[PDB]
Amino acid sequence: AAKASIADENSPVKLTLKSDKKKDLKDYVDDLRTYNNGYSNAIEVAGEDRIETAIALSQKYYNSDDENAIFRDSVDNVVLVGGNAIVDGLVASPLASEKKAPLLLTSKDKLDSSVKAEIKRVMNIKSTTGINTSKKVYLAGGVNSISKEVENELKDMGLKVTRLAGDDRYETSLKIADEVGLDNDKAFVVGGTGLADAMSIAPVASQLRNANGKMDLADGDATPIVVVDGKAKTINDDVKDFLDDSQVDIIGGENSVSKDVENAIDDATGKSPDRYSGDDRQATNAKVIKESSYYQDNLNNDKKVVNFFVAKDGSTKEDQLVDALAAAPVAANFGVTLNSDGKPVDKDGKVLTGSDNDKNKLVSPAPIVLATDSLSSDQSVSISKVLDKDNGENLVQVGKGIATSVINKLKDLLSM
Amino acid sequence: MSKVETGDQGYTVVQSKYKKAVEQLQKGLLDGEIKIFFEGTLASTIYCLHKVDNKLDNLGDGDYVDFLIITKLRILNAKEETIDIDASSSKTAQDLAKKYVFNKTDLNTLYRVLNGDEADTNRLVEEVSGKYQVVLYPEGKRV
Ligand code: NA
């Protein structure tokens, strides 16, 4: 008909748009391109139970052809925690991001079949009775959260099984934090009850960052999290030995990390901890989003924060925060899609040429706005200030149960 | 750049209207070479036209045929669907966006010609059947 861009092979239909006046169809094209941009750039990822939601995250962003996914090809590692053992892998988000791995959940007694199938797909496991030692699985939790039969069945599939466990919640947490590593002289410290506090900090903690705080998805390193006994006067000798020379950022109020603990960390690190805390978890999350060096100074492009995530808080059951666990590795890497060679690719999978398409410039990480039933005004101010003039381009909802009232208010700040 | 693929400047014809296209090709006599591609695989350089006929006759869901005359032309197996935006019961621009994924760049340069910023030298806005019309192809269904 006309000299235009030729269509795709898999085009479902050929739309012919007709109108008596050219201004009418000009308006329709304007309306179409606007709502096409919004619907393509606002997505929810969730599952039925805590296990399936972790599976859903892995399917979309790991070993998938989806654009804006983290990895186009299969992965090698997988992080596994107990089902309701939120406390046996609460600090595992930086580990999953560092290991380029998804974070999945399992029952205590028996390895769930859905998990078994998920491990095969994301890892491209060919046979379950051969040997797959090129693939590693990390078990976060003791024998009373992930029992022996689960680890035995996991080895029956020829999988490497590494257990990170201690005699309690605090010891096991130090095993996971030490696995992540203190590779930037910077850490996050929460209390024995600050479960929501560690979820607010997980997405930025999972960011693969340069020493200059810049974005680097090929060499960057994450930041670990430690949960300590906040209902005490001093801090444990194990916690002291881990936090050495570190610029510790306490996330949480004095009821979970007491002033005695804060001064103990000051006495154990030589630097005054930078406390980021409001009166509740939502106010603490707002200060995290608002921080310039958290989501703004990391960028290599001329633009400001563009992409955003959102997950539940534990105001009701304290076990919903597991969804923010699995989302944190993804949000920290949003912005560019990399193949198994670490190169930025398009929708069709072809590499991008030119210095303008540097994967460190195209990447733009996303905070997790912690909100289950309402969005705090302090969060709204932060999101607006960190946004770029040209407006936002992505919003990802993680898990079931987040009110849409939070979702569309976000879309107004990002102007999608 | 002498190859037909998505986004290339040229002409696009649905597999149901291929005969009238290829008929304007034989009468051409080079306006006085016609290269034919079967799903990007070679079929004819230029009866053979009946061989091309049969391929377009039994095209499948993910199958497509390309042509090259200075001019490019692709023929694919999409269904035909016309929406009169001046009519009720039609899908809104939102409902069309919720179901289909559209190319943003093509929608941009289409608007610019419509707004008057560009002279319609390539007849993107066509005065046909008494109305003003444009052709739009999605890139897939929204999952
Ligand atoms: Na590390």
Distance of CA A141 to the CA centre of its chain: 20
Q: Provide the 10 A C-beta neighbour count for residue A216.
A: 19
CB contacts of B69 in chain A (<8 Å) are none
Please give the Cα distance from B49 to A37 (Å, whole number).
Answer: 42
Residues of B in contact with A18 (CB under 8 A): 82-86, 129, 131-133
Which residues, in sequence order, are bridge partners of residue B11? Answer: B73
Using DSSP's 3-state secondary structure scheme, residue A369 falls into strand
DSSP-assigned states of every residue in A59-105: HHHBS---TT-SBSS--SEEEEEESS-TTSSTT-HHHHHHTT--EEE
Residue A87 within any structural domain of the chain: yes
Question: What is the token pair recorded at A52?
Answer: 């399936």
Q: Which of residues 38-77 of A touch B (CB under 8 A)?
A: 38-40
- Cβ-based burial of A390 (10 A; exposed 0-12, middle 13-18, buried ≥19): exposed
Number of domains comprising chain A: 1
CB-closest option in B81, B86, B122 to A2: B122
Is residue A276 included in any domain, yes or no?
A: yes
The two counts, helices (H) then strands (E), for chain A are: 15, 13
Tell me if chain B has a CB within 8 Å of the CB of A35. yes
CB contact A32 to B (< 8 Å): yes
User: Are A199 and A324 spatial neighbours (Cβ–Cβ below 8 Å)?
Assistant: yes
Quick check: helix, strand or coil at residue A246?
coil
Centre of ligand 1 from the C-alpha of residue A135, in Å: 19
Which residues of chain B make contact with A350, given a CB cutoff of 8 A?
none
Ligand 1 centre to CA of A248 (Å) is: 15
Which helix H or strand E contains A331, and what residues bound it?
helix A322-331
Considering only CB atoms, B9 lies closest to which of A5, A21, A35, namely: A5
Ion ligand 1: residues, CB < 5 A: A 180-181, 183, 221
DSSP alpha helix (H) spans, A234-310 = 237-242, 259-269, 281-290, 292-295
Give me the residues paired with residue A311 across strands: A370
Q: Tokens for A51?
A: 């296990």
Query: Residue A123 is encoded by which pair of tokens?
Result: 């890892």
User: What is the span of the domain harbouring residue A114?
Assistant: 45-413
DSSP character at residue A340: T
- Hey, is the C-beta of A341 within 8 angstroms of any chain B C-beta? no
Does residue A170 lie in a domain region? yes
Q: Please choose, from the candidates A153, A157, A108, the residue with its C-alpha nearest in 3D space to the C-alpha of residue A132.
A: A157
Q: Please indicate, yes or no, if residue A34 is contained in any of the structural domains.
A: no
Distance A223 CA to ligand 1 centre (A): 7
Measured between beta carbons, the chain A residues lying within 8 angstroms of B5 are 6
A18 within a domain of the structure (yes/no)? no
Residues A26, B131: C-beta atoms closer than 8 Å:
no
What is the experimental resolution, given in Å to one decimal place?
Answer: 2.9
Reduced to 3 states, what is the DSSP secondary structure of residue A379? helix
- Core vs surface per residue A130-168: b (16+ CB within 10 A) or e: eebeebbbbbbbbeebbbeebbeebeebbbebebbbbee
State which residue of chain B sits closest to A348, comparing Cα positions.
B6
CA distances from A224 to A54, A134, A181, A202, A353 (A): 21, 25, 6, 9, 35
DSSP state for residue A147 in the 8-state scheme: -
Task: Test B82 with A18 for CB contact under 8 angstroms.
Answer: yes
* Range 82-101 of B in CB contact (< 8 A) with A: 82-86, 92-94, 96-98, 100-101
Look up residue B16 and give its DSSP letter: G
Q: Is residue A134 part of a domain?
A: yes
In a domain, A250, yes or no: yes
- Chain A residue numbers with beta carbons less than 8 Å from the beta carbon of B130 are 20
Q: Are strands A77-82 and B9-14 parallel, antiparallel or unpaired?
A: unpaired
Please tell me the number of Cα atoms within 13 Å of A179 on its side-chain side: 24
Return the SS3 of A242.
helix
Task: Give the number of A-B residue pairs with CB atoms closer than 8 Å.
Answer: 189
Counting Cβ atoms within 10 Å, is residue B72 exposed (0-12), middle (13-18) or buried (19+)?
buried
DSSP B113-135: HHHTSS--TT-SSEEETTEEEEE
SS3 content of chain A, % helix, strand, coil (to 5): 35, 15, 45
Tell me if residue B136 falls in helix, strand or coil: strand
What distance in Å separates the CA atoms of residue A363 and residue A208, rounded to the nearest whole number? 11
User: How far is Cα B141 from Cα B138, in angstroms, rounded to an integer?
Assistant: 8
Question: Which residue from B11, B74, B105 is facing A1, i.e. has the nearest CB?
Answer: B11
C-alpha A209 to ligand 1 mean position (Å): 10
Helix, coil or strand: residue A303: coil
How many CB atoms are located within 10 Å of the residue B104 CB?
Answer: 13
Is A34 touching B (CB cutoff 8 A)?
yes
Does residue A28 sit at the B interface (CB-CB below 8 Å)? Answer: yes
Residue A226 placed within a domain: yes
Contact A4 B122 (CB under 8 A): yes
d(CA A276, CA A370): 15
Q: How far apart are CA A354 and CA A296, in angstroms?
A: 24
Cα angle B63, A15, B121 (rounded to 5 degrees) comes to 100
Residues of B in contact with A23 (CB under 8 A): 114
Q: Would strands B41-44 and B35-38 be described as parallel, antiparallel, or unpaired?
A: antiparallel
